[PDB]
């Protein structure tokens, strides 16, 4: 169920209060570390020399409690961006004092307000604090979905609330965050506590916040309607947002007094836990990939490298994919040996990259379903897997299967093949070098032979994720280009991110390729119509493949093969984020390039601004032949 905390701006005795909120059912408490109304002077006498103590003792809780149960709040009189010099300077000192005290206690998080447009001096002081000593306490920026000014009651006669359309005007709250986070150079220690009001904005504004590092959602007691019986509940719109925020695994903060006075507070909270336990439970895929959300991994190179036993284990633990392969061969067998030929015609069928033989088994289940006769070769270069094939073969398969222990590009075959069957696709289709591998093997396919798969196509879509941009940035390594980490793709279960446009196809390969002069290099210009304001952080890659006729695999979210969990999307990052305004077209250019030895991707954004060309000459990233 939910992790949730209570926000108070009044705590008479820290002991008894914390007891109450634990009792109510809360996991933690947001409270001031100095009394909210206890303004302090640092420069002008006499107020300067006020006898202490300045606040209550750290001995009032266990170090354990401080580390786990308490979120600090900045005192609301502290205004680092005051236009009054004297107030700036006190707020500068007072902020450092309060932050330095939060650090002294070892608080896990500390709340700061974003509630005006200009937070330049605030960012300066926090950035300065983050770079003084070392702690790893989190900074939750309290930002409202809707500015307080655009949420006021229309009751000032001479200053009315303009009833016109303002597309950008009602997004200003994100620009507040964006500018602050940019000033702090995207510090991993600065996140958003998103404050929700009684009137939700337009979906597109809630859509700005999609790819942002939301650690908390604040629910004031206001926004809660009342059901017949008397309990508090939420509008159907507020509920959609909660269901969305739950899939982002944010912490919920309840703030303000009890306005449903004929109940305990643990009613407000009970309603979240009702909402949590009442969502469509996680499907096969969401359950499988549950610990991988926005986790970067190097893309496998099963050519250049020998995959580990436990890697093949997960490829194999995926029935839906092998059902499709089974069906595709079954159909191909029937379109190749007529019923009258069924006991005169043995089809010669070659698995190319057989691993531990899940395709070899599918090929046998195929023929003993279509009732036709097959001779199996199992070509596999990874001699560690070839141990597994030959033990299987000796023990069960028999002479039907010949295990070949070589590269399909080098192997001299005794006979030509009817059907070659391969599983050499990466998350970006051609990125494990399925093209080069099958090109080198097509000479031992008959001049009328089928390849399964026959076609694959890679897809690109531009994304916004200030979260994932940070996970990449965090991949810098000693003894290489300090920007290398941005010039290479990552396999990742993209989770906290915003798709800025529908995926379009990028690169397509056909097998066999009968072209007299085979060239596997490519240039592909793509134009992404964007109908929102946002920031570009990279391009998600997916693929679809035609195994045979109308039997297909896809990880394209639209056409995604249901309950198939053998591939995560690939991510192509860009060094510098690019602002994209509503109506602007994102134009990306991708090249597939090659030597005798290496294959790689170069890529560049050309609109609405140009990027640097990423990974020129595969300097940061190559794929070994």
């Amino acid at each position: 169920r939910v992790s949730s905390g209570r926000d108070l701006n009044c705590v008479p005795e820290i002991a008894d209060t914390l007891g109450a909120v634990a009792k109510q059912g809360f996991d933690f408490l947001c409270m001031p570390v100095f009394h909210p109304r206890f303004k302090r002077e640092f420069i002008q006498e006499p107020a300067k020399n006020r006898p202490g103590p300045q606040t209550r003792s750290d001995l009032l809780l266990s170090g354990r409690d401080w580390n786990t149960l308490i979120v600090g709040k900045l005192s609301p009189w502290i205004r680092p961006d005051s236009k009054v010099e004297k107030i700036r300077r006190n707020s500068e000192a007072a902020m450092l004092q309060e932050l330095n005290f939060g650090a002294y206690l070892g608080l896990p998080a500390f709340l700061l307000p974003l509630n005006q447009e200009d937070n330049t001096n605030l960012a300066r002081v926090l950035t300065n604090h983050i770079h003084t000593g070392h702690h790893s306490s989190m900074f939750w920026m309290r930002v409202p979905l809707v500015a307080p000014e655009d949420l006021r009651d229309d009751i000032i006669e001479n200053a009315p609330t303009t009833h016109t359309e303002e597309y950008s005007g009602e997004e200003k709250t994100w620009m507040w965050w964006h500018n602050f986070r940019t000033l702090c150079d995207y510090s991993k220690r600065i996140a958003v506590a998103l404050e929700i009001g009684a009137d939700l904005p337009s979906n597109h504004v809630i859509d700005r916040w999609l790819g942002e590092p939301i650690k908390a959602a604040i629910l004031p007691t206001s926004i809660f309607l009342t059901n017949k019986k008397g309990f508090p509940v939420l509008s159907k719109m507020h509920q959609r947002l909660i269901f969305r925020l739950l899939k982002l695994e944010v912490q919920f903060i309840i703030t303000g007094t009890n306005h449903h006075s004929e109940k305990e507070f643990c009613s407000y909270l009970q309603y979240l836990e009702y909402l949590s336990q009442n969502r469509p439970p996680p499907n096969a895929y969401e359950l499988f990939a549950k610990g991988y959300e926005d986790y970067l991994q190097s893309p496998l190179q099963p050519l250049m490298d020998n995959l580990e036993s436990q890697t093949y284990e997960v490829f194999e633990k995926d029935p839906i994919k092998y059902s499709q392969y089974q069906q595709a061969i079954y159909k191909c067998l029937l379109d190749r040996v007529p019923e009258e030929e069924k006991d005169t015609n043995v089809q010669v069928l070659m698995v190319l990259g057989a691993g531990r033989g899940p395709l070899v088994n599918a090929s046998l289940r195929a023929a003993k379903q279509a009732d036709r006769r097959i001779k199996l070769y199992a070509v596999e270069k990874n001699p560690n897997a070839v141990v597994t094939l030959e033990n299987w073969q000796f023990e069960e398969w028999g002479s039907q299967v010949t295990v070949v222990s070589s590269d399909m590009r080098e192997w001299v075959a005794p006979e030509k093949a009817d059907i070659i069957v391969s599983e050499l696709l990466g998350s970006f289709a051609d990125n494990e070098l399925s093209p080069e591998c099958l090109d080198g093997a097509q000479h031992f396919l008959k001049d009328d032979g089928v390849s399964i798969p026959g076609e694959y196509t890679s897809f690109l879509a531009p994304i916004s994720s200030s979260k994932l941009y940070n996970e990449v940035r965090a991949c810098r390594e000693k003894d290489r280009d300090p920007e290398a980490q941005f010039e290479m793709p990552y396999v990742v279960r993209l989770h906290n991110f915003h798709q800025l446009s529908a995926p379009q196809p990028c690169f397509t390969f056909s097998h066999p390729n009968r072209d007299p002069m085979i060239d596997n290099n490519r240039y592909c210009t793509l134009e992404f119509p964007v109908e929102v304001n946002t920031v570009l952080h990279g391009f998600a890659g997916y693929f679809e493949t035609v195994l045979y006729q109308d039997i297909t695999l896809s990880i394209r979210p639209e056409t995604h093969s249901p309950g198939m969990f053998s591939w995560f999307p690939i991510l192509f990052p860009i060094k510098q984020p690019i602002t994209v305004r509503e109506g602007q077209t994102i134009c990306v250019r991708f090249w597939r390039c090659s030597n005798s030895k290496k294959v790689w991707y170069e890529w560049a954004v050309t609109a609405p601004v140009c990027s640097a060309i990423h990974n020129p000459t595969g300097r940061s990233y190559t794929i070994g032949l």
């Binding site: 820290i14 206890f38 107020a47 609301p76 107030i87 006021r152």
Partner: protein, 310 residues
């Protein structure tokens, strides 16, 4: 000390109000140390404060007191940190102070209250940005208004009209209210957006004028009729927290600030008196009804100073 009166009075004196009969009301908060709370004290002897032993009555509040006002003679209206406006009724003998009502209606600290000219109604201001109008008889909120875009600094009821009050906020607006209009609020104040307003006092007689102090230590005399800032002076080096008009037929303006100084000013805002006697912040003032040239101030330095104003 009396029965059910705390042994120790909390350090930070916030409120100081004389009743018609010369008795002194004190509110005080604990703004540091283990226990963050407040207390109410009646001193029939104004010269014996702050001392807890020689007081007529006192009581412990759940939480600190941000502002305080008399409701007539026996009533005490309190702006709590708790988000509550609480009304403390005074005893028959006036020996203990009992809670009459305590209503948690605001969502953040209640920073300011004011009793309307009738005395059956009050308007509160909070850091939750709401302003509310109370029925003290019925103990419920009549009206709830989000006029502002920032925490409400100060709400001041008009002397003579039960439907009019000024308010001011960190959103830089001074709002003239009138609960008769269907859009009750009206944004008045100087030509160019200036420094934030921090305090409001109506003139006790010229029902059409008032003063506002800003966070830059500048007191300003304004006409709502003329609705154009006639006069002002740089009185204080820091924020003006309180403005209090004397009871004289031609009255004086007491000005208390965070520069730990008290000023007293004529009707043209020239300086007549000034006092350093406070060595922490100056938090309130009330003039003696008995001696019109005596003035009483309280600080966060736990001092109760009495001044002879020429």
């Amino acid at each position: 000390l009396p029965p059910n009166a705390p042994a120790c009075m909390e350090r930070q004196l916030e409120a100081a109000r004389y009743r018609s009969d010369g008795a002194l009301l004190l509110g005080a908060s604990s703004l540091s140390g283990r226990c963050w709370a407040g207390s109410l004290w009646l001193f029939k002897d104004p010269c014996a404060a702050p001392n807890e032993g020689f007081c007529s009555a006192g009581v412990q509040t759940e939480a600190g007191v941000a502002d305080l006002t008399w409701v007539g003679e026996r009533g005490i209206l309190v702006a709590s940190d708790s988000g509550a406006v609480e009304l403390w009724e005074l005893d028959e003998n006036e020996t203990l102070i009992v809670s009459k009502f305590c209503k948690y209606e605001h969502d953040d600290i209640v920073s300011t209250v004011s009793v309307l000219s009738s005395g059956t109604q009050a308007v509160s201001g909070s850091k939750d940005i709401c302003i509310k109008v109370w029925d003290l008889a019925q103990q419920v909120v009549l009206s709830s208004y989000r006029a502002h875009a920032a925490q409400v600094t100060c709400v001041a009821a008009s002397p003579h009209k039960d439907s009019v009050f000024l308010s001011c906020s960190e959103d830089n607006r001074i709002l003239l209210w009138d609960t008769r209009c269907p859009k009750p609020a009206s944004q008045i104040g100087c030509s160019a957006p200036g420094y934030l307003p921090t305090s409001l006092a109506w003139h006790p007689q010229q029902s059409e004028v008032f003063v506002f102090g800003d966070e830059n230590g500048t007191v300003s005399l304004v006409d709502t009729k003329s609705t154009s800032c006639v006069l002002s002076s740089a009185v204080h080096s820091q924020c003006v927290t309180g403005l209090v008009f004397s009871p004289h037929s031609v009255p004086f303006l007491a000005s208390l600030s965070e520069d730990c100084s008290l000023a007293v000013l004529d009707s043209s805002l020239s300086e007549l008196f000034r006092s350093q006697a406070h060595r922490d912040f100056v938090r309130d003032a009330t003039w003696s009804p008995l001696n019109h040239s005596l003035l009483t101030t309280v600080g966060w330095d736990h001092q109760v100073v009495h001044h002879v104003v020429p």
